Design a protein around this ligand. Sequence first.
Ligand SMILES: C=CC(C)(C)OC[C@H]1O[C@H](O[C@@H]2C3=C([C@H](C)COC(C)=O)C[C@H](O)[C@]3(C)/C=C3/[C@@H](COC)CC[C@H]3[C@@H](C)[C@H]2O)[C@H](O)[C@@H](OC(C)=O)[C@@H]1O
Ligand SMILES: C=CC(C)(C)OC[C@H]1O[C@H](O[C@@H]2C3=C([C@H](C)COC(C)=O)C[C@H](O)[C@]3(C)/C=C3/[C@@H](COC)CC[C@H]3[C@@H](C)[C@H]2O)[C@H](O)[C@@H](OC(C)=O)[C@@H]1O
Ligand SMILES: [Ca+2]
Ligand SMILES: [Ca+2]
Ligand SMILES: [Cl-]
Ligand SMILES: [Cl-]
Ligand SMILES: [Mg+2]
Ligand SMILES: [Mg+2]
Ligand SMILES: [Mg+2]
Ligand SMILES: [Mg+2]
Ligand SMILES: [Mg+2]
Ligand SMILES: [Mg+2]
Ligand SMILES: [Mg+2]
Ligand SMILES: [Mg+2]
Lengths: 235, 235, 6, 6
Amino acid sequence: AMGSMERASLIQKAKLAEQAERYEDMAAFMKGAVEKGEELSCEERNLLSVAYKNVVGGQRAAWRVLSSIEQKSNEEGSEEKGPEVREYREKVETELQGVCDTVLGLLDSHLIKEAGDAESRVFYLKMKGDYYRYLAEVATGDDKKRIIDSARSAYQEAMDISKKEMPPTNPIRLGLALNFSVFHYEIANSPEEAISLAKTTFDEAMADLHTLSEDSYKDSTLIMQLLRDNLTLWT
Amino acid sequence: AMGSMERASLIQKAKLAEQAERYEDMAAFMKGAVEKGEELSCEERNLLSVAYKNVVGGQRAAWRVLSSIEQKSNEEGSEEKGPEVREYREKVETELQGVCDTVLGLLDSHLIKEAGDAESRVFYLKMKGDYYRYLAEVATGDDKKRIIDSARSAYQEAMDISKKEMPPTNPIRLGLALNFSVFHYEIANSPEEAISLAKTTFDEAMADLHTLSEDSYKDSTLIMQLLRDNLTLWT
Amino acid sequence: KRRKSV
Amino acid sequence: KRRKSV
Ligand SMILES: C=CC(C)(C)OC[C@H]1O[C@H](O[C@@H]2C3=C([C@H](C)COC(C)=O)C[C@H](O)[C@]3(C)/C=C3/[C@@H](COC)CC[C@H]3[C@@H](C)[C@H]2O)[C@H](O)[C@@H](OC(C)=O)[C@@H]1O
Ligand SMILES: C=CC(C)(C)OC[C@H]1O[C@H](O[C@@H]2C3=C([C@H](C)COC(C)=O)C[C@H](O)[C@]3(C)/C=C3/[C@@H](COC)CC[C@H]3[C@@H](C)[C@H]2O)[C@H](O)[C@@H](OC(C)=O)[C@@H]1O
Ligand SMILES: [Ca+2]
Ligand SMILES: [Ca+2]
Ligand SMILES: [Cl-]
Ligand SMILES: [Cl-]
Ligand SMILES: [Mg+2]
Ligand SMILES: [Mg+2]
Ligand SMILES: [Mg+2]
Ligand SMILES: [Mg+2]
Ligand SMILES: [Mg+2]
Ligand SMILES: [Mg+2]
Ligand SMILES: [Mg+2]
Ligand SMILES: [Mg+2]
């Protein structure tokens, strides 16, 4: 749908969509930019991830509402409404899945293959881990296990690279750790691992802060605070 | 698209969509319920208006962002970006217009024709005035005048009925007055009329509050406060 | 403060 | 308080 628009026009429109909180549009513009076949810049990767994060974020929030209703209507002494709650939860779930598959597909051809620099490769592998994780949040079937492992292996590979190649205060490194810790906590049923990861990550970033310019690491600061919020919630 | 679903299932799903903040879905379910050809109940009219109010509300908010950017890029010493801002503002505008036309169309066949009770007829005429008003917010062409007059005539007819048939604290009567006052202020370039309407409306509702049960008029209270907010902003 | 409607 | 991700 975006094949007739210049790459630069798609990037510009993704930035306008962001300002207008039109995240579906933003995601469609960024998909079209990716499909031009050139690697994305640091700024363009951020637009890509923000667009899809917001689209799936709204779907996942809806899915959680509908799932909670559905689960309530399946309890002790709740009364039979009929199939509507389940159908509508399935409709939202299916659309969410289709957006995850779209992102995963863009990642696998060809953001991940062509990413040589550490900051881009870790960024894309983090996205791959995130979107498999959102698949795992709704998976109840045969392949829940395989989906969970796909998220784990993406996050693990990102983690391996980020440790070798990036400082501990790098905001991509920090975000990856934050999300991988969430994965361990609520997807992999490994809250000790989640806690240990969040703590180690936070502590190592604190100790490396002396190397940093400020206010040039406001992203790193915010993410350190989310790690702290999780540690507070979980301990 | 909704012709195969039972009316009651569409109403139920519109309520789930509301809880999930899935307003596009909500609007589509309510459109499908209207198309069953039975009159809507008081509760169902509210679902209808809330669904579309939220969909168009997000579009109008986006349109305002993009318009402000566009107008900035057309000023003294702003530099030529190219056609992207205008194209993307036009795309948002076109979709907004299409949603207004969809609502107006549902109103004209056949919510308005079949509404005999005062509360339903005023409610639908208020919607007709609102959606013509949102058309007028973006109209810059030949028919801006005709669109503005269509909003005025709908609001005027609603106002005439609501005065004859409803008490001054009726929340539909109050909301209609609130919106008609906004129309006068920023669409019809008649701020004196907007102010006089908001004041009279508020004062008459205050004087009729003694007749009311509470907490049975929380909607009327909130709308009286919006009238007060406008009067504060405008005077 | 943007004006209110309902 | 729902746990944070980024
Ligand atoms: C403001 C919107 C746009 C233009 C899209 O930028 C989003 C943000 O983009 C950058 O921030 C990134 C970033 C975010 C920061 C944590 C936001 O920081 C602040 C202070 O707002 C959240 C965004 O979603 C984004 C792009 C995402 C990620 C996440 C991506 O996973 C695949 C990993 C961690 C984080 C990294 C890439 C952050 O560097 C910038 O460093 C931020 O600006 C500052 C001053 O920190 C800007 O707000
Ligand atoms: C909560 C969501 C649903 C179920 C959709 O209901 C929306 C709301 O629906 C009713 O409120 C209506 C109503 C609104 C109230 C002002 C909300 O009141 C409170 C305290 O939240 C705003 C809604 O958009 C709605 C449906 C719209 C209108 C507007 C319609 O124009 C065509 C005219 C004024 C207003 C009227 C119809 C209000 O009566 C009810 O009276 C409200 O509940 C209470 C306690 O007042 C409920 O919040
Ligand atoms: Ca605690
Ligand atoms: Ca004032
Ligand atoms: Cl459905
Ligand atoms: Cl466009
Ligand atoms: Mg080209
Ligand atoms: Mg049922
Ligand atoms: Mg399913
Ligand atoms: Mg322990
Ligand atoms: Mg039937
Ligand atoms: Mg340009
Ligand atoms: Mg136009
Ligand atoms: Mg005067």
